[PDB]
Amino acid sequence: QSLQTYVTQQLIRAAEIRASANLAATKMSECVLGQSKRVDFCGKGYHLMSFPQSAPHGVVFLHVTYVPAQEKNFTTAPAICHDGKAHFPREGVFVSNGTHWFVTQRNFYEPQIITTDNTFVSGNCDVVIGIVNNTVYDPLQPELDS
Amino acid sequence: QSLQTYVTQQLIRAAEIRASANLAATKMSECVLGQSKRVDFCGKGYHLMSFPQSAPHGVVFLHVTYVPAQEKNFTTAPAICHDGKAHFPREGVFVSNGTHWFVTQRNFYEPQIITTDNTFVSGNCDVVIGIVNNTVYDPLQPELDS
Amino acid sequence: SFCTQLKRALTGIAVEQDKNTQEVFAQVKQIYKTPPIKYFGGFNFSQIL
Amino acid sequence: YECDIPIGAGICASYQTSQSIIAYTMSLGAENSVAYS
Amino acid sequence: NGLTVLPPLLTDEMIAQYTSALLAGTITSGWTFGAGAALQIPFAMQMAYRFNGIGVTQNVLYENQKLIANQFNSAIGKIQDSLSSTASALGKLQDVV
Ligand SMILES: *[C@@H]1O[C@H](CO)[C@@H](O[C@@H]2O[C@H](CO)[C@@H](O)[C@H](O)[C@H]2NC(C)=O)[C@H](O)[C@H]1NC(C)=O
Numbered sequence: 001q002s003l004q005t006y007v008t009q010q011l012i013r014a015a016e017i018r019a020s021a022n023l024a025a026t027k028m029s030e031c032v033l034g035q036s037k038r039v040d041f042c043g044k045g046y047h048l049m050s051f052p053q054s055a056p057h058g059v060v061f062l063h064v065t066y067v068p069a070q071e072k073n074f075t076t077a078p079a080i081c082h083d084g085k086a087h088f089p090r091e092g093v094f095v096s097n098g099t100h101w102f103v104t105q106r107n108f109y110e111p112q113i114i115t116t117d118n119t120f121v122s123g124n125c126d127v128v129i130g131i132v133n134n135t136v137y138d139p140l141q142p143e144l145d146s
Numbered sequence: 147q148s149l150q151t152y153v154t155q156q157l158i159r160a161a162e163i164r165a166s167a168n169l170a171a172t173k174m175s176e177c178v179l180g181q182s183k184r185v186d187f188c189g190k191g192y193h194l195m196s197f198p199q200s201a202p203h204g205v206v207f208l209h210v211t212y213v214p215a216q217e218k219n220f221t222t223a224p225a226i227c228h229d230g231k232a233h234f235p236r237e238g239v240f241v242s243n244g245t246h247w248f249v250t251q252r253n254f255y256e257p258q259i260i261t262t263d264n265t266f267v268s269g270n271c272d273v274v275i276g277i278v279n280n281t282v283y284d285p286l287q288p289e290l291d292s
Numbered sequence: 293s294f295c296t297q298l299k300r301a302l303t304g305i306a307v308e309q310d311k312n313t314q315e316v317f318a319q320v321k322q323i324y325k326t327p328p329i330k331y332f333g334g335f336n337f338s339q340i341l
Numbered sequence: 342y343e344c345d346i347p348i349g350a351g352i353c354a355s356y357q358t359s360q361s362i363i364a365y366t367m368s369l370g371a372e373n374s375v376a377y378s
Numbered sequence: 379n380g381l382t383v384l385p386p387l388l389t390d391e392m393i394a395q396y397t398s399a400l401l402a403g404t405i406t407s408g409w410t411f412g413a414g415a416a417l418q419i420p421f422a423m424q425m426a427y428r429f430n431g432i433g434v435t436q437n438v439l440y441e442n443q444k445l446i447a448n449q450f451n452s453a454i455g456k457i458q459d460s461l462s463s464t465a466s467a468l469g470k471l472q473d474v475v
């Protein structure tokens with residue numbers, strides 16, 4: 001009976017260890033051999049890479065991740081009216097520091113002038129809730145004028 | 147012996163419950179703290195968000211997902227010839243309602259005129275199988291003419 | 293020591309249950325709270341808040 | 342404070358300042374209202 | 379006969395607080411609170427981010443905002459009714475107990 005108890009405990013603990021080993025193999029495949037979009041799977045933050053290290057009866061992953069550091073407030077707007085046309089950002093968000101409007105990335109404050117390259121138009125300015133009035137620069141205009 | 151039977155059943159059921167709890171923790175990390183690209187992991191459809199709710203001995207996820215609703219037939223084409231050059235869509239699919247050709251998104255019918263901004267050229271028109279003849283509008287032409 | 297190891301197994305199971313609850317729910321560092329205004333762009337969360 | 346020795350039903354215990362054993366309700370974390378508008 | 383039940387460490391109120399914190403973070407900051415500090419963003423713009431994330435341009439969200447809000451509210455109401463009508467809904471938890 002003592003031997004049977006030991007063997008049953010060993011079987012249950014071996015099943016648990018096998019689950020842990022399958023998780024470790026998945027983390028090796030996804031965190032180390034690639035970059036993972038799954039949240040909190042390869043560490044807290046936006047995953048950049050991972051490095052494996054061996055250990056007695058286990059593995060240790062060093063997860064290198066990207067964490068935003070210093071946030072600042074800005075006044076935002078879903079879209080922008082220039083000539084009765086609503087302009088939406090191609091990749092970024094419209095922000096304002098109080099007087100002027102820029103379009104920036106969503107994870108790093110890098111303001112840029114709002115031009116027709118950063119934005120695309122869709123419809124008139126009677127549907128979007130919270131739209132604002134600002135000028136959208138046209139790169140071709142000075143070249144044509146020159 | 148009765149006590150040993152009870153404890154063994156409890157150990158097995160606790161392993162099952164721990165597997166379920168690990169799954170729930172993963173769903174909390176990925177569905178709730180982010181947006182998941184994994185199919186049918188955070189509900190059926192294209193996952194938008196998720197909201198957790200507690201419950202006795204468990205958790206309940208309200209998965210908000212996006213489901214296409216009203217589909218329509220269109221005549222499609224892999225590419226388009228304008229001047230002996232094959233034009234492919236940057237982000238979308240070429241569709242036709244019977245007489246005219248447009249380029250639209252792949253998940254929401256929003257037809258647009260086929261211009262050089264929506265498409266990119268690659269090679270001549272002797273390789274693509276199923277290519278069609280249509281005009282690709284050039285935005286700079288009227289500006290130059292004006 | 294059959295009784296002692298049965299007791300040990302049950303204690304381990306109980307601690308594991310507490311750990312399961314902690315892992316599932318304690319994923320947030322700070323206890324956030326919504327502002328008194330409840331206009332989230334037309335969406336109505338009053339039944340889950 | 343953070344839970345040191347779990348007693349149960351939200352009550353934990355620790356050894357803190359003479360020094361003695363203190364029982365308390367565990368702390369989930371610092372509250373933080375997000376400046377939403 | 380010596381068989382007793384120990385109370386869970388986290389009371390139901392603490393679990394409710396945890397879920398409330400997760401919900402408030404999700405609503406007021408999107409997914410940003412799961413990576414670092416919670417960064418506030420208007421909910422319509424966050425939903426436009428999600429629409430971009432499923433491959434739909436955000437102008438679809440901005441031009442159908444009221445319709446999407448109404449659909450979400452109706453779905454939440456139907457969840458309410460389903461929970462309040464069918465008693466045999468939480469089968470798994472009751473099976474565990
Ligand atoms: C918001 O940003 C704009 C653009 O950087 C600022 O405008 C410039 O401000 C500097 C002063 O630091 C001047 O030297 C430039 O001539 C300004 N440029 C233009 C085109 O006006 C603006 O001052 C910022 N507003 C605030 C409140 O900081």
Ligand SMILES: *[C@@H]1O[C@H](CO)[C@@H](O[C@@H]2O[C@H](CO)[C@@H](O)[C@H](O)[C@H]2NC(C)=O)[C@H](O)[C@H]1NC(C)=O
Binds near residue numbers: 132
């Ligand atoms: C953005 O600019 C447009 C036009 O420059 C403004 O539209 C005008 O609104 C006033 C007041 O409602 C009307 O009397 C005019 O007839 C409108 N003009 C046009 C061309 O539509 C609009 O109000 C501005 N937006 C904001 C928030 O001030």
Ligand SMILES: *[C@@H]1O[C@H](CO)[C@@H](O[C@@H]2O[C@H](CO)[C@@H](O)[C@H](O)[C@H]2NC(C)=O)[C@H](O)[C@H]1NC(C)=O
Binds near residue numbers: 243244245246
């Ligand atoms: C396919 O779509 C095109 C573009 O919308 C249609 O062409 C327009 O049709 C309307 C009639 O509803 C006319 O008023 C416009 O003048 C047409 N525009 C052009 C540039 O011709 C076309 O009719 C559609 N074809 C079918 C079979 O529905």
Ligand SMILES: *[C@@H]1O[C@H](CO)[C@@H](O[C@@H]2O[C@H](CO)[C@@H](O)[C@H](O)[C@H]2NC(C)=O)[C@H](O)[C@H]1NC(C)=O
Binds near residue numbers: 227
């Ligand atoms: C698309 O247009 C091109 C040219 O406008 C067509 O190519 C012509 O095909 C005919 C018949 O095979 C030849 O006699 C011509 O010499 C070709 N011209 C050129 C410039 O290559 C092509 O056939 C059209 N595609 C379809 C499906 O009709």
Ligand SMILES: *[C@@H]1O[C@H](CO)[C@@H](O[C@@H]2O[C@H](CO)[C@@H](O)[C@H](O)[C@H]2NC(C)=O)[C@H](O)[C@H]1NC(C)=O
Binds near residue numbers: 338
């Ligand atoms: C969000 O939904 C709740 C319930 O679905 C709404 O609360 C109802 O409001 C109406 C009118 O004020 C009352 O007649 C009902 O008795 C309320 N029901 C409950 C359960 O409180 C609430 O009004 C909705 N939010 C908004 C902004 O309309």
Ligand SMILES: *[C@@H]1O[C@H](CO)[C@@H](O)[C@H](O)[C@H]1NC(C)=O
Binds near residue numbers: 071072073376
């Ligand atoms: C943004 O403004 C609010 C206004 O109270 C303030 O509480 C918050 O700290 C500001 N955000 C940052 C990053 O300073």
Ligand SMILES: *[C@@H]1O[C@H](CO)[C@@H](O)[C@H](O)[C@H]1NC(C)=O
Binds near residue numbers: 217218219
């Ligand atoms: C497309 O055409 C086929 C032709 O039989 C038809 O069966 C199908 O229902 C059509 N699709 C839609 C969405 O109506």
